[PDB]
RNA sequence: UAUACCUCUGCUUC
RNA sequence: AGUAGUAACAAGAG
């Protein structure tokens, strides 16, 4: 199970 | 943090990610209104490139002709149409000395094909300029109007069946003093009615004989229609494209078949090479030019492109090409192949609709036809069109057409012009300088390779190629073309970089719904995925996504969402009943709100074949009812694999014709259709195989039905009643 | 029905329009008036279909009773309208009419449907009955070749197929009988029985028949498998960077095993040659090789096909070896005599010099061509005897012709007229002998006349024949028609016989590396070893980069410890054996420069380290062979440039990125600090160093022939890559 | 003859070749940096980043569009009942009264109890639709005599300068959210390992796009054009109100039905493909137009309440605008989901190439990293004059956004720019690889490129991005210039 | 003519002549080939039998 | 002029 | 107005 992330959220 | 999508090119090189530089998810530019400004542009520019040659008035047509061939050579880089015959012939001799036997064999193969080729061949020409009505029509109708017209002038070459007598009638019809032809006009007739007043007026049409004088017919026979090209990608400003008449089609077919037979055996021509094979040609052609000069040999590849390709190549050169190529063939075939260039050498260009003038004060508009083009002060046109109309005068005809001796149209002699481009590649050297060039040609796009010891020589070898092409009427684009060291290049939107990269964006529009019908579009949509996985480098995940996205576009377009889902619609209301009625729901097609059972492995299998075992007997019996009404009378560019079921339907005919003067053609069509439908009932193979015979169409049906009657009686099918009745009917016929 | 046709014909002839149409229009012109219509060519059907589906009644219906069984509405939904269509003259309807018909319409006869569309159903069972294997990630070379897309029932040309279709569906309208009818009489008899009771339209049957008869051959990128039942699954079999082992269902052809069997054995041999004890590798691999489903042992045992490469493996495993040759249509087997090919220039009959490989020495073969059989005896360009049997005329004729051409007789060579250098239909130059085969099979009158005749055998069992394949007293010179019808293998893969003679040469297999027909597989570790050039090039350099930590460290310690690794044997099987030692001695010396001197280049160390496996070969002087580029087998692309980058290998020092056959690799974090302004001349020629920079007084850029002849301690100019002059000393 | 003609031909006939150097590559489009010009305005069909969707929790199954907009406005009735117009900004040639009357007519028509979504053919609807504005056709004989009639001088696009709203659109459309919008249907079951690799790859590739902003903007364009084309053929003469619909699912798995605004369909007797049907958009928003006024000269903005967006209060605006589309562009909107494939293929190629190098499925490695390898990193953009490393996911979305912007701003200026600029791209790659590239008439290349930079936002911003990228490559070329030498 | 010849041969259930015949007798169920010679009839007869 | 708040048309070319 | 962009639509026809 993939949940994308980022350094602006 | 400002995001920049161009910074992807720091990591991944441009060829590796070339798909991202093509905006093919977006919209292509369409044309609006008239293309007369674009057509006049081409007329002015075509003569602009050949105005220093020889002007003379044609005593046949009465038109202003210009001739650049064997004229003064250019002293500038402006597109030159001034080709030199000797240099073309030498380039052809070099091609013959390196490819001997091809020139005569291609002429014999074409000549042997021509003899077998029939008249019906001309029906597959798509849109054709009908000289009788002066409109673009279907090729089949344009051909029929010409045969019926020819019959009124006592020219029955089509009755023999072969193409030769028909093409003989065409060159013979030029000599006729007055060419008669049909033109339909209406008649009122009181048909008996039950309408208070006991009658009804229905306008029955009837044909009328109409005449044109010899000169006005020759002009129409030499004329070419024009219109703007829609959906031309990768370009800002639009341009014009032409359409030819029925006379010249037969002669072009031979010249292109002749030039095809030449291009097939040439190794430095990319035509008619299939896109998949073009890499097999290019990658190996590159491999040769790589390992050829080891010692400091700078092999350079030139990404080429030609400017004014059609507007500079002269028919007069193409005529000399046929005369050289048909050296060994007999005289009748030499005269046959010469006709098509001769017609293009004296051709006439039509200028489309015209120009629309308006007044913003009164809110009015009106089109000015090309005949009335000059029935108005030139100040009332806009600034640019005022300049065009002044330059058009010397080449303008009274009846509203433009004379145009030099230049070709967009897509006419594709093969034969490729030959001339290959002939430029065949020289390879000039003056025994230290270099050797080679390349691949395909109409206006070429790829030149140049090997030499130092790059200063390469650029002179390219310059020698540039100056050579000028003598052939071929102009290289200094602006668009560019040169680099061999290893990567571009050719017809195919990007080499130590191997041709995949360019998925080019094929992306094809993934959508095609527009044939539910049954066909499904097969087409899965096949496009299958093919793009193989050829255009699409992985399994992106391919499985395309399987989903197509079904999405397929279900909204054809309004056939899942039967269990609760999407509302006229069809969906019946789909939800079919979902509740059917037991084998996985057997239902998507067109009937069924589930999508496709995946990577079964793309090549039709949907009806996949789910056949899962269907209910009543569902497959209704879905595949042999005599169902939705599939019409079928008859045997890419093809597909699909089953002929109820979803293999055809749409309604365009009804706009109903309220125009061309209603006649509906009764004209259905009259033929009734005869052909009965002829097909007499001859079941007529749908499959082309029937042959110069005898009467009725005779074939009469004899066949007589034998069917005689055999059905003597075998024991018809009684004496039905046999004597059948012979009594046939006796009257 | 005949009465209804004639009645409809009479009613139609009442119309003066139709009567004149039927009398004036010809049977040829039927093809024109059928395509006459007001219909226009849809230039944007994707758009027009989306537009037409938002309208009420876009579909058109055929006028008939079945159309009338559809109601005008259904529970408020408007199915169809009264207004007719222009083309069909039937009621126009909506897309809901289709869904209604499928739900509440008449249940029709679908008997025969599975036999009509058999061609498609055979795809379903070829997928249902199939079994998938392993998916593996790694490079693949794709060769773009013309291949058959779908498997056929019996392949024919269009002209031949149409007549067969015509005989099946419309026998009364076939016209002139053709020879195809007699050839395919059982295929007609079969299709006539299968497609008898169905109600589906003939035009549909002719379309399905034409699919399973006429061939669709198109260019596609392929690797490994090239059979039709594999091509149809080509999308799943392979990619540019991945492979998928696939085993289709149903029966497979015997000839298809023969094609792959040869390529399999050759590829086994080409690898095991370079490594010492070839027999050990050849048996290790061949035991665990698979052709689709069958192992190579079983295929070699059951199939009596073979060739040079095939037999060599049969010996290495066990069981007999069949020395059988195939000359186009003629199939041979070797009774005795081992000939040897020699290239000579023969001035053939028409008057042209031709380079042809003549077979010296005496030979004897057991021959067979189609149905005719016999025994052949030949020598260097001479038919000594030809004892054949009686059979069909075309088989007896072609057997004698194929024996005359295969024997390379001077009476055959001096019997050519006109030209015999014609290409095939695609445009490819055929080989010298096959050109003569294609010519004399057609034009045999020049051969029979130039051959000569002699007395027939007067023994009771023997007979003679003449030009027209009939018994005669004056037989052809050397022709006779008769009424009567252990081994071991070396370390270096040459077969020896008990008497000491050698019958199979390891250096006798063909170098032509063609594509197989079925799925070639190697049930072993290290499959890549039996791979294509670029597959091995890319894998090899990956094995280098993967172990660059220890290999670069051990190069400062272990002198010649690294140069021979397990992985590099595969890379050597690529290299031309006539240059392997020359490259190795050069690559080792350039590498030893960077070792013993203080000038290292990791991008070069990675480039040349694989070339150093094969035992080196220096010059007479002791200096190695200098090179610009190290060429590899197959294709002009495959070479590693020493100074410049190359299609197989290049390095980008801005990003510190290495390109190996397209794929990107990063060297960042594995490079020394002093490699900024470290010229490349110090690892281009063995025993050379950069002193200064291009001095015009030294002259031009000196070639290898000059550089090798330069004396030690002598300056000269060298050009690295375009635009980088350097001044180098020995 | 060839050689004898080449002797007598003039020397002026030549190719004038010159070897390409980096200083010869001058930034393309010098006029876009000039402040004397007006900055390019927002000209898309619908809003993208500034949108504001009114949510409504449902079962997750299709309902009628009017009933959906009714129940959405039932939940957020404070804005629906607002009949008091608070006008913030106004388009030059617009009519406050007509537009607001239209908005109220739409709101009330959709809110009513009856079935039909038809709108009364009022005087304000006839202005916003442009009734009767077509000119009357007359005979050629009359127009020839009428000397006041003339051929119109053609409207040429204006020369606009760079605007930062494009940059911000790109920045925001590429970012992640908590809301999945795609409607991807089912497929057959996986059997072959390739299908299991592809399915496992989709979990990484697809949901990377699905969760981002551009995915919802795309689905909005698609589903809207899908119904806008259906009304345009079914109800031709009837003015109709169409809602801007899109179903959405959050990370917890609850179906939110979003409503971004309401639109007025014009009169749609569309014969030709290029025939226009004017559409009037009334769209919700949280953006104050006075912040970036240069962005909204085509829009007319109201202020119709407030909402608790991210906990705190936010002012709700109503962006009103008269717009237009045609049969072609509505179709290409229905076929706009293909913006996935163009970006998903491009990056799956990098995953497959990386799997070739290391011989196993490098999908998880590229995205997240793993035991052996680190995560794939790309130069994603700038920040105060220096590079920034973005992850594989971001580089995926940046392309997907770029592919969406190719459609939303797709016209002849884009085609002409992309094509002619792609030539100047390839030359730069040759210079990057050091393949000594030569050019024959570079001014011709620039003249062909620069004529396509007029008033397309994406073209003008790509020309700016191209010159920033071209500038950063020139600093890297200082590495290669002095290698060896 | 070929349609007649094939329809007769197929209906009567016999082989189709490889060349085009001239007549066909319904009572005999046999195709007929007419020949008009100048000199002897026996010369033209056995040549057709080939 | 009238029928005509009617009728036909949505790629059907003048 | 607006769509749009080197010329059109913003209904046409009887």
PDB file of N, CA and C in Angstrom, chain B residues 31-72:
ATOM      1  N   UNK B  31      -8.779  24.936 -39.694  1.00  0.00           N
ATOM      2  CA  UNK B  31      -8.953  26.096 -40.553  1.00  0.00           C
ATOM      3  C   UNK B  31     -10.308  26.743 -40.294  1.00  0.00           C
ATOM      4  N   UNK B  32     -10.449  27.977 -40.777  1.00  0.00           N
ATOM      5  CA  UNK B  32     -11.685  28.737 -40.628  1.00  0.00           C
ATOM      6  C   UNK B  32     -11.977  29.451 -41.935  1.00  0.00           C
ATOM      7  N   UNK B  33     -13.145  29.183 -42.512  1.00  0.00           N
ATOM      8  CA  UNK B  33     -13.581  29.942 -43.673  1.00  0.00           C
ATOM      9  C   UNK B  33     -12.824  29.563 -44.931  1.00  0.00           C
ATOM     10  N   UNK B  34     -12.469  30.580 -45.713  1.00  0.00           N
ATOM     11  CA  UNK B  34     -11.877  30.369 -47.023  1.00  0.00           C
ATOM     12  C   UNK B  34     -10.384  30.085 -46.914  1.00  0.00           C
ATOM     13  N   UNK B  35      -9.864  29.418 -47.940  1.00  0.00           N
ATOM     14  CA  UNK B  35      -8.438  29.209 -48.081  1.00  0.00           C
ATOM     15  C   UNK B  35      -7.912  29.878 -49.332  1.00  0.00           C
ATOM     16  N   UNK B  36      -8.640  30.886 -49.818  1.00  0.00           N
ATOM     17  CA  UNK B  36      -8.229  31.576 -51.036  1.00  0.00           C
ATOM     18  C   UNK B  36      -6.951  32.372 -50.809  1.00  0.00           C
ATOM     19  N   UNK B  37      -6.796  32.961 -49.621  1.00  0.00           N
ATOM     20  CA  UNK B  37      -5.565  33.669 -49.316  1.00  0.00           C
ATOM     21  C   UNK B  37      -4.365  32.744 -49.278  1.00  0.00           C
ATOM     22  N   UNK B  38      -4.560  31.522 -48.778  1.00  0.00           N
ATOM     23  CA  UNK B  38      -3.472  30.550 -48.750  1.00  0.00           C
ATOM     24  C   UNK B  38      -3.201  29.972 -50.134  1.00  0.00           C
ATOM     25  N   UNK B  39      -4.244  29.797 -50.950  1.00  0.00           N
ATOM     26  CA  UNK B  39      -4.049  29.303 -52.309  1.00  0.00           C
ATOM     27  C   UNK B  39      -3.353  30.345 -53.175  1.00  0.00           C
ATOM     28  N   UNK B  40      -3.786  31.605 -53.089  1.00  0.00           N
ATOM     29  CA  UNK B  40      -3.125  32.666 -53.844  1.00  0.00           C
ATOM     30  C   UNK B  40      -1.680  32.817 -53.388  1.00  0.00           C
ATOM     31  N   UNK B  41      -1.433  32.664 -52.085  1.00  0.00           N
ATOM     32  CA  UNK B  41      -0.065  32.680 -51.581  1.00  0.00           C
ATOM     33  C   UNK B  41       0.808  31.695 -52.348  1.00  0.00           C
ATOM     34  N   UNK B  42       0.327  30.461 -52.503  1.00  0.00           N
ATOM     35  CA  UNK B  42       1.101  29.439 -53.201  1.00  0.00           C
ATOM     36  C   UNK B  42       1.291  29.799 -54.671  1.00  0.00           C
ATOM     37  N   UNK B  43       0.266  30.372 -55.303  1.00  0.00           N
ATOM     38  CA  UNK B  43       0.371  30.743 -56.715  1.00  0.00           C
ATOM     39  C   UNK B  43       1.436  31.816 -56.901  1.00  0.00           C
ATOM     40  N   UNK B  44       1.407  32.851 -56.059  1.00  0.00           N
ATOM     41  CA  UNK B  44       2.388  33.928 -56.169  1.00  0.00           C
ATOM     42  C   UNK B  44       3.788  33.395 -55.892  1.00  0.00           C
ATOM     43  N   UNK B  45       3.929  32.591 -54.836  1.00  0.00           N
ATOM     44  CA  UNK B  45       5.248  32.104 -54.448  1.00  0.00           C
ATOM     45  C   UNK B  45       5.809  31.131 -55.478  1.00  0.00           C
ATOM     46  N   UNK B  46       4.957  30.278 -56.052  1.00  0.00           N
ATOM     47  CA  UNK B  46       5.431  29.331 -57.057  1.00  0.00           C
ATOM     48  C   UNK B  46       6.027  30.061 -58.256  1.00  0.00           C
ATOM     49  N   UNK B  47       5.372  31.135 -58.707  1.00  0.00           N
ATOM     50  CA  UNK B  47       5.921  31.937 -59.796  1.00  0.00           C
ATOM     51  C   UNK B  47       7.060  32.828 -59.322  1.00  0.00           C
ATOM     52  N   UNK B  48       7.065  33.204 -58.041  1.00  0.00           N
ATOM     53  CA  UNK B  48       8.164  34.001 -57.507  1.00  0.00           C
ATOM     54  C   UNK B  48       9.492  33.266 -57.623  1.00  0.00           C
ATOM     55  N   UNK B  49       9.473  31.940 -57.513  1.00  0.00           N
ATOM     56  CA  UNK B  49      10.682  31.131 -57.579  1.00  0.00           C
ATOM     57  C   UNK B  49      11.086  30.778 -59.005  1.00  0.00           C
ATOM     58  N   UNK B  50      10.308  31.196 -60.009  1.00  0.00           N
ATOM     59  CA  UNK B  50      10.591  30.834 -61.393  1.00  0.00           C
ATOM     60  C   UNK B  50      10.331  31.987 -62.359  1.00  0.00           C
ATOM     61  N   UNK B  51      10.263  33.226 -61.869  1.00  0.00           N
ATOM     62  CA  UNK B  51       9.900  34.360 -62.711  1.00  0.00           C
ATOM     63  C   UNK B  51      11.041  34.846 -63.598  1.00  0.00           C
ATOM     64  N   UNK B  52      12.268  34.379 -63.374  1.00  0.00           N
ATOM     65  CA  UNK B  52      13.397  34.749 -64.217  1.00  0.00           C
ATOM     66  C   UNK B  52      13.603  33.787 -65.380  1.00  0.00           C
ATOM     67  N   UNK B  53      12.707  32.819 -65.564  1.00  0.00           N
ATOM     68  CA  UNK B  53      12.825  31.865 -66.650  1.00  0.00           C
ATOM     69  C   UNK B  53      12.261  32.375 -67.960  1.00  0.00           C
ATOM     70  N   UNK B  54      11.242  31.694 -68.482  1.00  0.00           N
ATOM     71  CA  UNK B  54      10.675  32.004 -69.789  1.00  0.00           C
ATOM     72  C   UNK B  54       9.162  32.110 -69.669  1.00  0.00           C
ATOM     73  N   UNK B  55       8.626  33.303 -69.921  1.00  0.00           N
ATOM     74  CA  UNK B  55       7.185  33.510 -69.969  1.00  0.00           C
ATOM     75  C   UNK B  55       6.687  33.363 -71.401  1.00  0.00           C
ATOM     76  N   UNK B  56       5.582  32.640 -71.566  1.00  0.00           N
ATOM     77  CA  UNK B  56       4.963  32.506 -72.875  1.00  0.00           C
ATOM     78  C   UNK B  56       3.504  32.106 -72.701  1.00  0.00           C
ATOM     79  N   UNK B  57       2.675  32.562 -73.634  1.00  0.00           N
ATOM     80  CA  UNK B  57       1.237  32.323 -73.591  1.00  0.00           C
ATOM     81  C   UNK B  57       0.937  31.001 -74.285  1.00  0.00           C
ATOM     82  N   UNK B  58       0.213  30.123 -73.595  1.00  0.00           N
ATOM     83  CA  UNK B  58      -0.174  28.841 -74.169  1.00  0.00           C
ATOM     84  C   UNK B  58      -1.276  29.051 -75.200  1.00  0.00           C
ATOM     85  N   UNK B  59      -1.008  28.661 -76.449  1.00  0.00           N
ATOM     86  CA  UNK B  59      -2.001  28.821 -77.503  1.00  0.00           C
ATOM     87  C   UNK B  59      -3.174  27.862 -77.345  1.00  0.00           C
ATOM     88  N   UNK B  60      -3.015  26.797 -76.562  1.00  0.00           N
ATOM     89  CA  UNK B  60      -4.110  25.855 -76.343  1.00  0.00           C
ATOM     90  C   UNK B  60      -5.112  26.422 -75.346  1.00  0.00           C
ATOM     91  N   UNK B  61      -4.659  26.679 -74.119  1.00  0.00           N
ATOM     92  CA  UNK B  61      -5.559  27.135 -73.066  1.00  0.00           C
ATOM     93  C   UNK B  61      -5.792  28.639 -73.115  1.00  0.00           C
ATOM     94  N   UNK B  62      -4.785  29.414 -73.509  1.00  0.00           N
ATOM     95  CA  UNK B  62      -4.856  30.856 -73.401  1.00  0.00           C
ATOM     96  C   UNK B  62      -4.371  31.384 -72.073  1.00  0.00           C
ATOM     97  N   UNK B  63      -3.450  30.678 -71.423  1.00  0.00           N
ATOM     98  CA  UNK B  63      -2.991  31.002 -70.083  1.00  0.00           C
ATOM     99  C   UNK B  63      -1.548  31.483 -70.119  1.00  0.00           C
ATOM    100  N   UNK B  64      -1.142  32.140 -69.036  1.00  0.00           N
ATOM    101  CA  UNK B  64       0.221  32.642 -68.890  1.00  0.00           C
ATOM    102  C   UNK B  64       1.069  31.552 -68.244  1.00  0.00           C
ATOM    103  N   UNK B  65       2.019  31.011 -69.002  1.00  0.00           N
ATOM    104  CA  UNK B  65       2.876  29.928 -68.545  1.00  0.00           C
ATOM    105  C   UNK B  65       4.274  30.458 -68.253  1.00  0.00           C
ATOM    106  N   UNK B  66       4.927  29.852 -67.265  1.00  0.00           N
ATOM    107  CA  UNK B  66       6.291  30.203 -66.886  1.00  0.00           C
ATOM    108  C   UNK B  66       7.122  28.928 -66.854  1.00  0.00           C
ATOM    109  N   UNK B  67       8.362  29.022 -67.321  1.00  0.00           N
ATOM    110  CA  UNK B  67       9.245  27.861 -67.451  1.00  0.00           C
ATOM    111  C   UNK B  67      10.608  28.171 -66.846  1.00  0.00           C
ATOM    112  N   UNK B  68      10.984  27.541 -65.726  1.00  0.00           N
ATOM    113  CA  UNK B  68      12.312  27.794 -65.151  1.00  0.00           C
ATOM    114  C   UNK B  68      13.386  26.837 -65.648  1.00  0.00           C
ATOM    115  N   UNK B  69      12.981  25.641 -66.074  1.00  0.00           N
ATOM    116  CA  UNK B  69      13.946  24.603 -66.417  1.00  0.00           C
ATOM    117  C   UNK B  69      14.889  25.076 -67.515  1.00  0.00           C
ATOM    118  N   UNK B  70      16.167  24.724 -67.368  1.00  0.00           N
ATOM    119  CA  UNK B  70      17.216  25.182 -68.277  1.00  0.00           C
ATOM    120  C   UNK B  70      17.243  26.707 -68.345  1.00  0.00           C
ATOM    121  N   UNK B  71      17.042  27.345 -67.195  1.00  0.00           N
ATOM    122  CA  UNK B  71      17.115  28.781 -67.091  1.00  0.00           C
ATOM    123  C   UNK B  71      18.399  29.214 -66.415  1.00  0.00           C
ATOM    124  N   UNK B  72      18.519  30.508 -66.121  1.00  0.00           N
ATOM    125  CA  UNK B  72      19.733  30.995 -65.455  1.00  0.00           C
ATOM    126  C   UNK B  72      19.794  30.530 -64.009  1.00  0.00           C
TER     127      UNK B  72
END
